[model samples]
Target chain A: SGFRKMAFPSGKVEGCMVQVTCGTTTLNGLWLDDVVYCPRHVICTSEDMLNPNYEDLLIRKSNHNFLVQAGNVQLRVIGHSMQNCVLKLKVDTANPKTPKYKFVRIQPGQTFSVLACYNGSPSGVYQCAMRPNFTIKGSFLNGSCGSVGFNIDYDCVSFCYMHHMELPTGVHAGTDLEGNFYGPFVDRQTAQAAGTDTTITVNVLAWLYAAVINGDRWFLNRFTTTLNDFNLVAMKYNYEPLTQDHVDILGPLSAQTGIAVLDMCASLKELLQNGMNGRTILGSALLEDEFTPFDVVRQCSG
Target chain B: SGFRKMAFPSGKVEGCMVQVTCGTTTLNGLWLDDVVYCPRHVIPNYEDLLIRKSNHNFLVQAGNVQLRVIGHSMQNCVLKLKVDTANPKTPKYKFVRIQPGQTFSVLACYNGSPSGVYQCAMRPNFTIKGSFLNGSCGSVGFNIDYDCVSFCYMHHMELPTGVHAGTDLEGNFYGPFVDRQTAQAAGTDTTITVNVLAWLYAAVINGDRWFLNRFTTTLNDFNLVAMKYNYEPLTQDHVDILGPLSAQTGIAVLDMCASLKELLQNGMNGRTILGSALLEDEFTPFDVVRQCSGVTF
Candidate 1:
């Protein structure tokens, strides 16, 4: 996470903006454990620059080129690993979201003006090897797997499923109301020092709300396949094995994440016609380099 | 079990492993004729397992021997064994708790030495937490697929405590004959007596239902058999008839089918139905054996 700063001329100084081109960051060159790399990376508010206690937050990118303004803002500063970082004094721009990153147009001048656009992932299995750094901490589903993060239609969040024994439904991999990458790990960790043995994998899970990947936290929705079309959703049955990715690109989380939820093929649609639910295993070779042990592809109704 | 894979938040996921506190996943158990089969793979997608169908509940029990059940969670587990020291026909049952952390050993053979020695034996419990700890012990995902391959010679097997009857011996055990290949052989004398034994024995286990419904039915079967040969019946039939006639075996014979089915049922429901009797690992050719003499019951 390295970033260089370019000061804007006084004419462009008042519109102070912290623009960080948040993208897939990784660990050891593997696409594993990377989370949404937003939050504390940059601060545009009434806070300190060098020693700012950046509020751990993730902004929802429901709007294309999603834009959000700082409240009662005065000072603006940038953290490390942020790209295309410029201080436009005025009233100028930047932000974050799904991947938890929204796509943005960097109007690069001596100062930075950003226009972002969000991209939905096509369906596929995804895994990002990840580790918690700098902020929060806790246990994970496949403690061995990193954050296989995604930016999907919030409607599909209700269907996210994890390989938990009891709390296997719904994942909140997105931001909490205030956006801090949270869910059960947040709920269960402090309750028990913790432990167990089971599948506990981070396959294709479902999501809701706008958020980023926290090293070990998330949330989701309950699913019923009757009304939902497999080709129409966000994680349309694709898998990306995490190779310990970048945590700065997505959350405080990032990786070389691939995409497509609804970007489905007809064969998948025919498979879903039988009313497959959120947790059903759809296909084996659905994604590039998919996991093939025990035929996880044929495990459920796929 | 995971690597048995697992980790605590903020905990290292380096190896992603979880260690059961009680100890090794499998316990060496010397249940009389039973072999404890713990369901777990040696490596990722390795070998051996239980038919974890879990029709709402998984199967657990101890006959020749008993073992502890590992599940979603297990805390304070204790094991029990009831040996009558009398006979396999009517062994008593009263759960005796094993020491807090007794190491168990599996039998070497059905009638011989220790199959394999075990230092860690599990305790049976009725609660989830009683057998597991979220990430340790039972909760850590330990499992076993026990089987009754080597059966105790029928004459040597016993009924669970508080009850005794011949049908328990006949009701289900007869399946070894009626359901397996022998059932198809029902075309012979062995079949004649076995099928008769099953139904006739079925008669005495319960009250009226056994005699009227099951017994009368067998009575008709014999009539049909007599018709098949046009009254040319085999000598074994008469002898078996008289055995039942004298309350010796079936027809009027071994009349306790009720206990048999119930015994088999309880044995599987995690109870000591077969009392202290266990099964053999290498099966004998016949249902019962004596000094190398094989006899199909």
Candidate 2:
């Protein structure tokens, strides 16, 4: 019924890990390299799904907060900031790569309150890695005078989807010049439709965790089954009072496949439109938007 | 034929003016708050645009060289910095708030660093003291005092709107820039694209201007342009010459004026434009807003 700060490994200042209880929840798929079999509402909700254990991780950050789940028991996941961080925000590609899932670029020079989740990529395994940025630098501070970077505390909300939907989508990182929509629709209908699908399995397709880091939007994929049919997709995001965030659509996918609910649909399309082993998105509006964050789907239809 | 050092007004080195020749080429739109007409090919080739001319602009700038076309004349005007330094220049300047369509020049200087020096092109002698200097000028060891504006990454330098315009340390108004002080502070070696739109009392040619869709092909472009818009440099020759000019009385050159950045307040302008073709005015007769009327392509 109530929640409190997570207790850490005795005497340690930085302890990373959060106990997430599931079984009764929806997108309960844990990506253990191979997809952790999670049957939507079918398996674990308030009980141990083969006892999901994320008991601990790397360190303490942004106040090692907990998602307090009636203090229930089932999946002990890295949950928000898994020091065991295995995040896999994916792309709806026939074949995916480890890099494709590296959507959020962290800021430069920051000893971040970094919570490297389970997977930032769907292809294999990855953790947030920091390298050189400038003259003797890290944190991507590549500009000469003025520049920007990503957030310190990264927590991908645990969600399940696309096996079917019809309600409303969710929120993500984009409030300023950070996210994308090079030519995608105002995704809402797909979620509405998926909500209506009865065969909706907890396969992990489309189920996503939304965040707004640095005024930009990010919808990271949690887990999934088949990374297929992502064209049918939609999502709603948090918007600041500034500019109403152009929710109209445009310009402007997915099945209940694993990443179906990520609603990066336009981003999936344009963000998906990447080549060079899924690197550059064709006609990507980020145009570098002077160097923020961006991705693309595939190029064209026919 | 050959270029020569331009002459100044004897008593002043901060003279604003240059001489440009045209009428023989294309797209020479001055956009004097109202696009000055320049035909694809007409008039002012060798004889100055009137025989064309940009004779005197608002100073001794960018080496003070002359584009001498066989020493010919027809246009007696500010080709670039043609300064009769007369009542008219100051007149149009003073009356700009009340009346509109007037010619004005801006100081092409501000906050920048060493390496690629941008100040020399704006006013050589003006930037020779208490500023960062590089290139050939560094030989004389001219440089900024420890107190000079040190970093571009300062919080005051970043602008998410990505554009800015306001006055420099000299209390003079300049145009807008990408405000990449934050972008560059963002890091080094990564490319960025941006736009510059400014509407200040002093437009190089108009009341308001725009350089839209301009992108930095690389991070190098970002630093280069930043250097240009935020100009400040110290050259060795400045120390050598000014040493003699201390004919006394005034004071140390640097003590005379501060560097662009320290002098520059956080520049912010709401306005921050355009296309033109065909034919013409010695001075754009329209107000600044109307001046942006026909900018196609």
Candidate 3:
């Protein structure tokens, strides 16, 4: 088993929220530790700024001016260079729910928004970028993006800031009732020095309320799909990774921040009509500029 | 054999806040799904003028008052019965942390200027509570909770509302990146629609962020330490009460949700001495109240 078991951020045990159940059987002995962890995908960025948050900047347009854009909007990858992946783009100002961001294929050396949106007259948030599939086609080129709204719906906060928010449902912990962390991050004792609104915590807790939804999906897929056996196994020893163990021991009282990457190579392949690997090896000749390693996306066995 | 299994809300694998982990080494890799589907308890009551959201109420205090005296005029939980949990019956504000709220025993709920300056005389946006956890007793009490705040910080938008935004580490999928799910319920989409924050989601994928903090203490003969366990099962199969069969057919997507809940609970508990059970138990209490003929907290 190549599954390399790793120790995640150490946390404490709080209790359950609802009738702890697997199916119809309520859990006999339920404690906070016995539960599992998972979350829904929240789109931090979107064509429209429907959701508002502290760090997120929402896009606004006074009215529906999909094209009259101005600004040198350039898009770049924050992480390492992804393989030969061409970018696609779509625009959906007519409908915020799905402002179709068109796909624009860019070469590794090209960058646009920088020189274009800066001098243009039209203004409204413009969304552009790489195709979404996990595989690659060619080196990703920088796509310029920016926007300005005409008759922007300020009242329609969600319609404006679709992906950002002061308290986006699933980003970080909620600020206390007073609009800030209890008291900025001080010592452990002083950390808990202030009080927060329970109702906020309760809403966050409700995120678990939807656990049943995920449970239902897993149930249908597990048997139907021949995936790895993900049965529960009480461990025999407490083996943790190196850095993880160190952080946990030093000050386990940090923020909740361990990330789990479930590789979806197989599933993604199944999603595309084309086979998992690209045809003709590479789609664009630009791929010759850089070597793209091919590795199936799967949860690195811990 | 005595290892306790606690869960919290970590983000979904598809979004922002990433899931976290904790607990016995044995309970890893379990299928996590459908754990995100529960009725949200958000209270944003916007009456004619005042906006009372989640728990934060925005108001405009008309007058002024003493700093210490202002802490006195606040509202606590409205008591259904006449029995008081503490003496003096004065509503005081309790000081607590961001997570598990119940860690600290109830104290007087106070509210005033964040600077702790202004004197009593003007109306203010203050916290009101009716009881305290006596060093001797362990039960709760009933009391009026219409407490107010200071006039200075008060404004037309000074509505005390509650908002939720967090993720769990060590729940379902693990990436070392605080790769959690992020969502937002938009008023335009439906009555609401939750969107995933793309950046945070990217962060969790690229950075192995972990949420770890401690909420332990040194007390009497035995150290009554409290902490949270983040590592929940990877899926719902392990915790699904109906076993695996029905879980697959009906509630197929619960494992991740279960994993998220597990992570958040532990994180909050470790950060706040107030047992996270207070935050969680309520989630399922309604159902428990409906089923068990003889179960009472």
Candidate 4:
């Protein structure tokens, strides 16, 4: 078999959301993850905006956005425009809901970066666009603003961004020996990981691809017919390509990965179908232009 | 050796299609084989329509829709489409086509709903022939035409609950009992055998009372003498004479005849011929023999 390897992004970025804003007070945004996180307000307890202890405040600028550090992972926030736009940040750690974000009061040239300590890892990084509408006036010794409005209005592009991270067994994120990352990389990280000769990631990818396509009833019913046709054509090329031993190993691997990837494909399908740029929980991004997840599956075999 | 022979339609009418017409306008049509038969504007295409006959099942009516026959050989030619006539509402794209001799579920293949009974048959040009239908077609009765080329269903009958019946290896009538009770009762041969035995005894007891009274008279003097001793009745000599009689009278009744012989032997063996003690306990062959054998000992 002619060999070809496709390099997909590595590590898993789950529930990623993003937004870009200029001096405009109105925040318009898009949710890049299937799970919805409602917007909330952030309060400053100290007069200093640059205080390393205030992890709740996230500010953006015209050319560059705030890059804050949370635990071992570094968070990157990039915004395109910031002219007379006051951007304040909000962190919702107490509420039962997911962490919400809000930025405000943008000036012509106000961009700041912070390296702060937080509890969680790459997943713990909370990226935001705009928090929901609310008013907080003269409550604490916060920086700069006397009163602020927390509105859910934000128009930013969001994605699950992670680098050099770990995943469940039989799957891990890493670069090739060439020093380039390729993932939500499938391999022997999981219990069902393949042997050295077999490409575990490829097999896992095929199974996930099959499951994703088969989830729809319309496609599921016609799958066998198409598969039969494919088999018939393949039969002309060679005989006994996949031996019993190959099937014994590959069967379980495909099924296992399929169970995990089915929902991810469905979520992406829904997001893309609804005209949104969505990111899978596993950090694989899905866009309308380049959204053939099963392209990797074309090379899948024993 | 335990084996089952399924009767499938022999011979194939290749590239066969039909257009069902009410009078002049086309109602529906279907292809008997896999070749595509495009629809005419006047008559609908075979692909769009799902047509079955009305014989309690129907046959494919003949028309200009290609009817060319090739020399008999096996190929993938059968066009089978399953439709659920039971509940016309659930219209999922459930369809499958298989060649002859493949085991397919009637209710599942016909796409029939579990609610009602459906009598499905193809049009006249195409005869629906199979041994498994009656059992697999569900609560509604299923009928199949034999001789795929002719009207030769001599063995056709209102099939029982779950049995495959059609021409046997010799092309003779064969109905294998699929019903559990009947199979167990008839020693796994045929339910008709038990019914035939009952009919023969009934004929002897009621319709042929005079015949029964003179049963001994019909037998030659030698057989009558042989009946006195079990040896002659059991011997091949009597078998040779009685074989043709049993054949004409249905080989099934010979079992009853054997029971009659056993009853006579037991009676001669001082078994208290018709004791109330024995009669109350069980209805033995003597009871049957007592009714048919009018001659006094």
Candidate 5:
């Protein structure tokens, strides 16, 4: 048998059609530039599995564009971050409102393609999203392999100090300060310029999300120290106070952190016992003080 | 000691100052009401703390109010659908900003005469996000006996059928479809709607998250049936024509789910027969079939 490339102008046979002989052939998966071949052995391999409905169908190379048996399909990705990457395909379908296909989440730098048997005028939309960190908004597209495809992006954010002069730090929404881990003190104007004489009941648990997600250890240390200082001063004057309920809560938390600190010191001491010197792990400044801090010496209370 | 409702003209005291009795009595914590009470009785009371200097001198609450505190201070649910039932004196400080004198989270709702000695003023831009969902966005003021606050709302989601169509009921991502679970007579122009194809891979794993989490039992049952069906399909023109590598990679998920279903049943049955069923705690419908289904038969 012979093969020829002919442009079918009309009727059931249309578009660019190519006939093949009784030999094996090859083609590439859509994303690849290289060609993938079909072995001579598998051709007509499934003829016994075919029915009259699929009579004209000749299962060619899995890679070859077999008409009436091949066409485009869509894919997508999903998630908060993936809002920047998922997509819907725009293709010929009975319902225009509903997309023919959608991929929930397409990862960063990933690629995808649709391969289908042709019937001449088939086309599709390849929508994609750019990485979020680089931009505020995501992009959407309409057409493909050519014009008619459009992209849109949207991402918006801002940064501000958590604490103002008199008030504690909080988030801002529009012109108003939106949220504070703790409730805000009244008379913020006077509070900011000066300071409040009254104390509030702070919830340490509320700060956990901010502390961990904030990704700043130094900030945590500073916040703790400041809180301690404020408490000391308030206790001296008897001018401010914490509610009993909150005091009860803080007691356990304070004890827990103390134990945690002790554990850290013990871990450091273990390294020393294992023959590791301070200069090796502690950088030479505090190696000598490790044992003293651990207080194996019983008489240092005075 | 007597209390006086003295209003300091904007500039009298600009910084936080402790106005102690000097001898007879010392200044204690401030409450919102205009009365002065002993501070020691306050819960977790620490009236022994001295006042630190106040920053503001003004007497207003918003834009630029100031407070003058003289003491040291230190400081510091529900699902869906309908059906819901549901401070303090300022110290000597002018309203600079409402810094926490002691405890950090305080926006109280006292129910008494507004105390004057312990209540302090606040700065602007105070916000609070409470646990029960109540909150204040900005601007803080106080009343003696008034309840001032902020109010939170849960959702379950499901999966889409269109996306999972033709996929294996139990395959990992990127795996191929199993030939045994799909219609082998697939051809051009043959419209395979999502509804008709869903049963082939009716396993819970293949179903949407919403259905899986809610109807775990139904999904498990359907999953078992799908596995048994995958073991047998239309022999005449029903086997996948695509190469095993392609077919498995594309849709063997259904087969995997089926396999998982069988294994789970086996494990449960084994445990029950070994005299563990009686010892086991409460079990849901899905659990009953999965763990004991194999044991019985």
Candidate 6:
């Protein structure tokens, strides 16, 4: 394949377009935000596409830019002033009042990315915005300081919209503007490098979700199933059977939620055993030490 | 001599006197604590000597118009108040206090004629304090004869059965005695001597009731012997009893200091045998038995 770079001077400034060919076979140029890349294998986006959208269309321009997929959000410094600058990132949810913000101090060239799927409220409407001029009240970099910026634009998208995409199969092993090669790869490194970009950031919300909703499932299947057996013994001795409601109420993995339901059940089991054995083995076992959610999680996951 | 109730109209009130006779001999008329008795072979005082001088003492007095005596158990009697009157009634009495002075009065004679002839006598081991006749009579009681007489009639009476005698080393026994006499007798034996002084010391030290009772009885006996000679009985009795016991058994009964002698005597004089002072000694009943008894009872 052969490639060439071209500029669209009339339609938009910095409309960088590049051409590509596979031995005289011409290929369609790819449009990346502001930059239109000709049928070239390389990838880049121009400044014109770094605009905030309204009602599914780009309405205003922005100095800072980022990308969002349904499963992830990425922020990077495509360019910067010579001095070190702090970028404040804010996410506005469907409820305008509930805007979540973060910050990142990119010294010069650094990419900050996070998987959106990892957050508990992954399926929600949000407007992601970035500003370089906000004061540090409190932010990810320092803390959230006060900020006033109608300057940069907001990229609003329903997170649900980005969750699914066409998996290009069998033919066009296309590359995105970031030069990220996406395809079923024969090489391990290429596949590994493909989705490696979406590392988790502050994934506590997701972890809690997993614990609360899928906790029993994980308890039964994960190595923590040892705890489940212990809980069953407890239930049996307590003259009761394990119920789903019990699992549901086992609830969160925080102190305020108190002991895990299964842990309580296991203790009751021990007490019953002691009674049945005429308390012969009294004071030997401690339910908490033997079984905790953390212990189970660590054992199973680790 | 002839009998006559003479009035010495010039002396104390009622100036009552009596003339008595012993064969053909005439004796001076004696005053029974200011009451004259003739042929004074008969003597009386405000004191009645209910004597159990060995292991006990009985004292009687006519005062506040009632007869009172002190002893182990001698207060049983009903005197006929107003025997001289047509309304003679056997008075049922009330027992008053027992220490310093015991006063008893027949309930019926409480308001009756307060004068009558009151005779005082003792039977074996009786309480003398809780008896009285009706009336406030002025009469003389008897005095204890300080003769070294055997008052054993008052004791060894109805030998107490199933009573605690004494203990061996590290243990005790109940009964095994016919009476206090046997207990005391055995107590003097090396076989089972009641270890009187040891019992005293134990009674003092441990406040055991059985030991205390023995100590009381033994001290009473000592005082009784001393009273035979009227050395006030207190100090002299301990000396007399302990001197003999020590002499016979080669023990230290009389070996105690004068302070201890005085202390024991104080108890006797006061008629209160509290073995508390025995605590001053460092010996146990066993020690006293070993030291005082040739044969430890």
Candidate 2 — number of clashing residue pairs?
Answer: 143
lDDT of 5 by residue, A69-122 (tens): 112332111111101111111112222222122112222111111111112122
Error of 3 at B230 (Å): 19
RMSD of each: 28.3, 28.5, 27.5, 35.6, 32.5, 52.3
Please tell me which model should have the higher lDDT, number 2 or number 3. 2
Query: Which ranking of candidates, highest lDDT first?
Result: 4, 6, 1, 5, 2, 3
lDDT of 2 at B54: 38
Q: lDDT per model, in order?
A: 0.20, 0.19, 0.16, 0.24, 0.20, 0.22
Off by over 4 Å in 6: A1-177, A182-302, B1-297
Proportion of native contacts present in model 1: 0.00
lDDT of 6 by residue, B153-224 (tens): 011122222111211111111123321223332221111112234334433332233312212234555455
Clashes of 5: 147
Q: What is the lDDT of residue B1 in candidate 3?
A: 5
Higher-TM-score candidate of 2 and 3:
2
Residue by residue across A123-185, what tens digits does model 2's lDDT show? 000011111111111111001010111221212211111111111211111101122211121
Candidate of highest lDDT: 4
Interface RMSD (Cα, Å) for model 1: 31.3
* Docking class of predicted structure 2: incorrect
The TM-score of candidate 4's chain A against the true chain A comes to 0.17
Off by over 4 Å in 5: A1-258, A264-302, B1-249, B259-297
Residue A143 in candidate 5, Cα distance off native in Å: 15
Q: How much is B179 displaced in model 2, in angstroms?
A: 29
Q: Looking at model 6, how many pairs of residues clash?
A: 44
| Model 1: per-residue Cα lDDT over B72-118, one tens digit each | 21111212122222222221211222221111111111111111111
